[PDB]
Amino acid sequence: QNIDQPTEMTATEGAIVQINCTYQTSGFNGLFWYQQHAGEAPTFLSYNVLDGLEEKGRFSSFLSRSKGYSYLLLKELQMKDSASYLCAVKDSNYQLIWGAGTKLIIKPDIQNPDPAVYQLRDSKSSDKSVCLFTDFDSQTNVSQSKDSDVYITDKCVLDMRSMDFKSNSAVAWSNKSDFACANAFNNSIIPEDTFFPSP
Amino acid sequence: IQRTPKIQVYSRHPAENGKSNFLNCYVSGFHPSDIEVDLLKNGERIEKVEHSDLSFSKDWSFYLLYYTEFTPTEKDEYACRVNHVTLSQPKIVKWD
Amino acid sequence: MRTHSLRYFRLGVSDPIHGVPEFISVGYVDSHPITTYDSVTRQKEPRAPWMAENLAPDHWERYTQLLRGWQQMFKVELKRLQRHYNHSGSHTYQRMIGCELLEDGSTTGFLQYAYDGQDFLIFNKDTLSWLAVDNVAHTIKQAWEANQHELLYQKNWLEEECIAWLKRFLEYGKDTLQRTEPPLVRVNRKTALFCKAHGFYPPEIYMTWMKNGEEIVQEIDYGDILPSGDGTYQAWASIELDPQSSNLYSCHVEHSGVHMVLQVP
Amino acid sequence: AGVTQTPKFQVLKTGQSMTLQCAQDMNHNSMYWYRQDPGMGLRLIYYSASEGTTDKGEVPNGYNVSRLNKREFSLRLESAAPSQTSVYFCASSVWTGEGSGELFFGEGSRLTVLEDLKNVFPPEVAVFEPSEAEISHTQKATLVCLATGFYPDHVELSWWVNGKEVHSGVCTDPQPLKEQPALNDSRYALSSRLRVSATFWQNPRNHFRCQVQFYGLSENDEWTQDRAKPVTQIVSAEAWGRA
Ligand code: NA
């Protein structure tokens, strides 16, 4: 008994994504999709047992019993759809077989990108120097540090709701004396027009 | 609605005196499922009497087979005695 | 193959006499019990040796847990029925589910419930709805039909899963279920002509009397097909003789694709 | 309330005992205990198809369960092993022997089982105030909170503005960073940003705090190290707006 779904998928805000699930089981009593936000509980999305397509808001779920195949279709993607999606099948003895889950990553639509690397103010309680790479469009990828005394987070999308404004950012820090925001992200491919304010 | 049991008494094989056989009592068509069944030899209950488990029919009634090993003779008389909630008194069906 | 069927029954009793179970559930392939469960043993167990020899302990352990749950569900459903009927005393609740694989390769599937031995709710897997016989059932029907996914689930179980189970059990029990033992047929007088058959398997048989080459079911007494106790069956049919006219009487028996005629001289 | 399981976080030494609690107030008959591990689907540990019965799932070794009543299904680790580090979910459903009825999950319990508690560290928390270059270029101001050096990854980071917790304009890393990616027991780092308008930042009465709740040891855990016992605790850092 086996269930397979891709490990990770990435699509853009507003677009459509189809998450596939294939299964081989001893008998079949239905196929479930669950949503699980990071750090949270799975919640029920859909159930199919006969062939065809079923719609629930912006989500649809399709089943082909002869092909042993289902997909979960998400349209008009929003940032809130970033989550893992779990497929599960009840077999002939009513046991649930669980797929390993597909992590869905959503790229925001940055309408006015303004890439820049900023030096944040030192804290009197810390020896760290902290640099913020922000406001770049979503095609930019932030690479991990090549230096073991330098730490770089992955990019994060923040939503300033009252301004309907989203931005990507990544943080880099170190306590090394030769660390500088001008070199912090040298291991990444960053926009040619990235703004580096003068020190 | 309650249904009274139909009661049929018969040998496994065509009976021949002196030949070992099985005497069957098939009780069927009754509802509800509680029922009393005794096989009788010359009016006396037979001890070593076996029976199938309660069985279910598609019309929601129940049936059961009661049977005992016996050798029929000319003088011995056999019967089946059944009691059910639909019976004011136990009913006896002689083996013919 | 001949026609074969798989079905599972459940019986619930609301106020059973001491010792007798409040809940029993038995499965059948054709006329053969294959499984049993009740509220006293609380174990699902085989009732045919070819089930015990082909289903691993994991099978009996898992369905034992499911039947413990189905037992509780049946208790709760019966309590709700007896309250809505406003009935006192002991009352019964019954369920039957199953399927048939016809000789020509077509299939049927069925699911129904009974209260006090009478039809109560009958499932139609084509229109995906429940037929209610009265207003208590009408209340249950509305609640069950509100859960469309469960109707779909039952249609898939009846049309696909049940047939798959049936073909699996037919292979396990093939030496029993797919054999043929022809009947031994004889005629005697008692005035009525009796035609008696015994020793046959499967139990499906047709015995009738013809007078001068014509059949008349109204004049014939048909006996039931009865278990002989050794795995075979017996049956009979009788007809009364006309002393006012000379007629040729013959017993006709049909079993597993063989026809037999016994002419009475 | 749905399904309520406790505790949300627990650190355990090898051989220690632990009971996870789960209650459901939905009048469900069937209850379940799952573990979730990276790279694989949920694995059932034990389940309870109805009040008064329980049975093993796929990975019952090292665990036991008790269906105490219709509401409650507890999971017991008699002698914790490192392999039992995992996230545990309790779930319930109306019945088990039916087809379409879904599961309802509890919030999850994250368990880390360690051979030695000397690897447990609380976070260091520091706040870094916005770049003046950012304020002049974008009319916006990003504060950064760093929570560094903690282990295990049992933390909850929150931002507090003028005494009240805020969520708008916050992004916290979904996953912590391993400070030493090769070390198997590496301590972690977590970053978070709060972005506000330049006008809001430039009000000298506005007050910003980042606080990290750490889930660590308790009174009964034995401590023999020279450093301070890394108990459950909140660690925070603040900043004030500047005119
Ligand atoms: Na165990």
Side-chain angles (χ1 to χ4, degrees), chain A residues 1-54 56-66 68-74 76-145 147-175 177-199, chain B residues 1-15 17-18 20-43 45-46 49-57 59-73 76-93 95-96, chain C residues 1-17 19-52 54-189 191-210 212-213 215 220-239 241-243 245-265, chain D residues 1-106 108-117 119-131 133-163 165-174 176-182 184-243:
Chain A
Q1 302 209 102
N2 174 76
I3 287 187
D4 287 305
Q5 52 187 135
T7 312
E8 170 192 299
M9 301 183 69
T10 303
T12 306
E13 181 179 31
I16 305 170
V17 72
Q18 170 184 120
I19 304 177
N20 297 321
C21 175
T22 60
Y23 63 90
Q24 303 91 35
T25 54
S26 328
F28 180 79
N29 279 299
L31 183 145
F32 294 81
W33 281 96
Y34 288 76
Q35 182 190 57
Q36 186 183 19
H37 287 112
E40 288 174 75
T43 66
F44 167 75
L45 284 189
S46 69
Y47 171 84
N48 294 68
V49 60
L50 305 186
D51 295 338
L53 184 61
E54 200 164 283
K56 256 173 84 167
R58 292 178 300 110
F59 294 6
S60 311
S61 59
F62 174 82
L63 176 65
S64 164
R65 278 170 303 171
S66 72
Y69 167 67
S70 172
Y71 64 74
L72 180 73
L73 186 63
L74 299 80
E76 314 176 335
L77 289 168
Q78 301 165 20
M79 293 307 305
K80 77 169 59 164
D81 299 330
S82 306
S84 284
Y85 293 85
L86 318 179
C87 171
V89 173
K90 283 192 184 164
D91 74 3
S92 62
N93 298 345
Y94 299 89
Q95 297 175 305
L96 270 176
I97 320 300
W98 288 85
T102 301
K103 182 186 184 190
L104 180 58
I105 301 171
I106 308 295
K107 296 185 295 186
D109 171 43
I110 308 301
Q111 278 299 86
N112 302 301
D114 192 11
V117 178
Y118 297 113
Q119 168 101 84
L120 271 69
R121 299 181 77 76
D122 290 333
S123 163
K124 72 164 65 194
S125 290
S126 166
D127 68 353
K128 294 165 174 64
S129 287
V130 186
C131 303
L132 173 72
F133 180 38
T134 191
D135 297 351
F136 49 91
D137 98 287
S138 301
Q139 301 275 25
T140 298
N141 298 123
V142 180
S143 299
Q144 34 169 271
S145 4
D147 188 338
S148 49
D149 300 305
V150 177
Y151 305 93
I152 300 176
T153 76
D154 199 1
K155 48 173 192 182
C156 212
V157 180
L158 77 76
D159 194 330
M160 292 181 81
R161 274 270 84 258
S162 61
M163 298 301 298
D164 204 60
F165 171 84
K166 301 173 176 71
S167 54
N168 294 305
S169 66
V171 180
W173 67 97
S174 183
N175 69 4
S177 62
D178 64 333
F179 176 78
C181 300
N183 62 61
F185 297 90
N186 276 3
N187 197 39
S188 301
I189 292 183
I190 63 175
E192 300 274 83
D193 54 307
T194 299
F195 170 46
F196 288 86
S198 299
Chain B
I1 296 182
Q2 304 181 324
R3 283 111 96 189
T4 198
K6 189 181 185 180
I7 309 163
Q8 301 175 76
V9 191
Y10 59 98
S11 52
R12 173 175 300 185
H13 314 278
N17 294 332
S20 192
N21 209 320
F22 278 85
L23 177 80
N24 292 318
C25 185
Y26 180 83
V27 182
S28 61
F30 57 92
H31 201 288
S33 69
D34 297 334
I35 194 136
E36 264 197 355
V37 179
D38 300 295
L39 306 184
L40 271 40
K41 172 178 184 172
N42 299 316
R45 166 177 156 79
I46 308 172
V49 169
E50 293 174 316
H51 71 88
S52 57
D53 286 16
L54 187 72
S55 296
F56 301 85
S57 295
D59 72 353
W60 307 118
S61 68
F62 312 104
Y63 63 99
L64 280 155
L65 178 66
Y66 280 75
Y67 55 101
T68 187
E69 206 161 0
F70 81 133
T71 302
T73 65
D76 288 319
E77 282 198 60
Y78 292 90
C80 186
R81 184 177 60 206
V82 178
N83 202 4
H84 191 245
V85 69
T86 52
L87 296 176
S88 61
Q89 59 186 76
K91 183 199 256 248
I92 301 188
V93 177
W95 176 48
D96 175 47
Chain C
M1 294 180 306
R2 308 176 285 250
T3 295
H4 293 296
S5 64
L6 163 65
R7 70 195 69 224
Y8 298 94
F9 292 87
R10 302 177 189 168
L11 166 65
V13 179
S14 65
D15 199 2
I17 266 87
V20 358
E22 51 193 322
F23 181 81
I24 300 164
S25 180
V26 177
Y28 296 87
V29 174
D30 305 334
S31 57
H32 302 264
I34 54 152
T35 62
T36 183
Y37 173 93
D38 62 59
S39 45
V40 176
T41 71
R42 288 176 61 74
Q43 298 290 337
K44 192 206 185 176
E45 300 165 330
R47 272 306 169 255
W50 42 269
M51 295 289 289
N54 286 291
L55 286 171
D58 190 56
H59 174 85
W60 310 97
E61 296 176 351
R62 153 111 279 231
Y63 276 91
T64 289
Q65 298 301 315
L66 299 180
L67 274 145
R68 290 178 183 182
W70 292 332
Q71 170 188 328
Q72 175 63 16
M73 187 185 61
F74 232 56
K75 183 192 186 66
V76 168
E77 293 181 351
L78 173 52
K79 177 175 162 278
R80 185 183 173 186
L81 253 40
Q82 210 179 312
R83 180 245 180 279
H84 285 46
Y85 277 112
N86 197 37
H87 281 172
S88 70
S90 197
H91 292 268
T92 67
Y93 189 47
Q94 281 166 282
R95 180 192 202 257
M96 185 193 67
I97 195 171
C99 53
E100 304 183 280
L101 179 58
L102 280 299
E103 189 176 18
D104 66 3
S106 59
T107 61
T108 64
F110 37 85
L111 168 58
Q112 45 182 35
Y113 286 80
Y115 181 84
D116 283 340
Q118 297 298 127
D119 284 343
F120 177 79
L121 280 166
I122 301 179
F123 184 59
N124 186 318
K125 66 176 175 69
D126 289 331
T127 71
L128 293 164
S129 69
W130 285 95
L131 182 68
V133 305
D134 60 23
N135 276 117
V136 182
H138 175 82
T139 302
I140 308 306
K141 163 193 171 72
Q142 286 175 320
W144 286 1
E145 287 181 355
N147 187 1
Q148 269 285 132
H149 286 166
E150 202 63 9
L151 311 180
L152 302 181
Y153 152 73
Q154 272 150 354
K155 177 176 175 72
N156 175 79
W157 196 88
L158 288 174
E159 294 178 349
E160 315 291 335
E161 282 294 299
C162 185
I163 289 297
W165 286 112
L166 176 51
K167 292 171 172 164
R168 179 172 173 180
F169 297 156
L170 271 169
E171 184 63 33
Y172 297 169
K174 54 165 10 276
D175 291 339
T176 297
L177 303 163
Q178 306 187 40
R179 83 196 198 274
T180 295
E181 297 192 49
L184 271 72
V185 181
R186 73 188 183 277
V187 172
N188 53 72
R189 295 155 166 255
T191 304
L193 288 179
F194 273 84
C195 182
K196 301 188 124 200
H198 71 104
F200 52 95
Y201 184 93
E204 288 68 44
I205 192 169
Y206 188 61
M207 314 182 59
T208 187
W209 277 100
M210 300 214 183
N212 308 311
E215 171 191 26
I220 299 164
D221 190 13
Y222 298 99
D224 299 329
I225 304 164
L226 299 179
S228 297
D230 62 355
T232 72
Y233 294 81
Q234 54 182 270
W236 61 267
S238 77
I239 188 179
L241 285 116
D242 181 20
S245 189
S246 187
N247 300 281
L248 308 155
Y249 293 89
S250 55
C251 182
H252 293 241
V253 179
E254 156 94 348
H255 188 257
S256 288
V258 177
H259 198 88
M260 188 180 333
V261 179
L262 278 68
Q263 265 250 263
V264 176
Chain D
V3 179
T4 306
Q5 68 179 92
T6 52
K8 177 71 168 139
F9 292 98
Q10 186 61 60
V11 162
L12 294 173
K13 187 179 186 188
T14 299
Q16 197 178 343
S17 297
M18 181 66 195
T19 301
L20 300 194
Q21 309 296 343
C22 179
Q24 53 90 17
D25 58 6
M26 316 177 64
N27 210 33
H28 288 176
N29 295 277
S30 304
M31 299 181 72
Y32 309 81
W33 270 109
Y34 282 98
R35 51 182 295 179
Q36 182 168 59
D37 301 287
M40 64 189 78
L42 293 180
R43 290 177 292 165
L44 184 61
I45 306 168
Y46 279 85
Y47 69 108
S48 177
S50 196
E51 186 176 5
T53 189
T54 67
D55 201 15
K56 297 178 162 193
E58 176 187 343
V59 289
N61 291 339
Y63 309 93
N64 270 293
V65 292
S66 306
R67 184 69 184 271
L68 307 138
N69 48 66
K70 197 180 174 177
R71 305 185 69 260
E72 289 176 276
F73 190 43
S74 65
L75 178 70
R76 171 73 166 176
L77 286 73
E78 196 53 54
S79 169
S83 65
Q84 294 173 302
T85 300
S86 191
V87 181
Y88 292 87
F89 290 94
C90 178
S92 64
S93 63
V94 176
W95 300 107
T96 311
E98 308 317 309
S100 72
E102 67 268 38
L103 295 168
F104 296 79
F105 283 89
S109 297
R110 179 160 191 181
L111 256 56
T112 299
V113 183
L114 301 168
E115 285 292 327
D116 199 318
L117 306 176
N119 290 131
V120 178
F121 293 84
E124 192 172 339
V125 178
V127 179
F128 302 86
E129 295 184 6
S131 155
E134 185 196 2
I135 288 160
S136 66
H137 186 64
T138 70
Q139 296 75 232
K140 296 173 193 87
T142 310
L143 296 81
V144 168
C145 184
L146 302 181
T148 54
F150 61 96
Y151 190 88
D153 175 31
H154 297 183
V155 294
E156 299 171 322
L157 185 152
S158 59
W159 284 91
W160 293 69
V161 172
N162 298 336
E165 174 168 357
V166 297
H167 287 92
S168 183
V170 172
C171 197
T172 299
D173 299 334
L177 153 161
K178 266 167 180 280
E179 291 184 332
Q180 289 172 296
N184 5 50
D185 41 10
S186 171
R187 296 154 73 171
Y188 296 99
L190 183 73
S191 76
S192 178
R193 317 98 169 108
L194 167 66
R195 201 178 202 177
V196 298
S197 70
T199 300
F200 194 85
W201 170 251
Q202 286 159 351
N203 189 321
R205 316 276 84 88
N206 283 334
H207 170 255
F208 308 83
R209 178 172 81 255
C210 169
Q211 92 167 6
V212 183
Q213 175 77 251
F214 176 68
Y215 294 88
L217 314 189
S218 68
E219 160 108 50
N220 279 345
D221 296 311
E222 181 171 62
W223 193 245
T224 62
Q225 305 301 115
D226 292 339
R227 62 183 173 93
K229 190 169 171 179
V231 299
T232 298
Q233 64 186 276
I234 293 170
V235 182
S236 66
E238 56 186 338
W240 289 83
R242 98 182 320 110

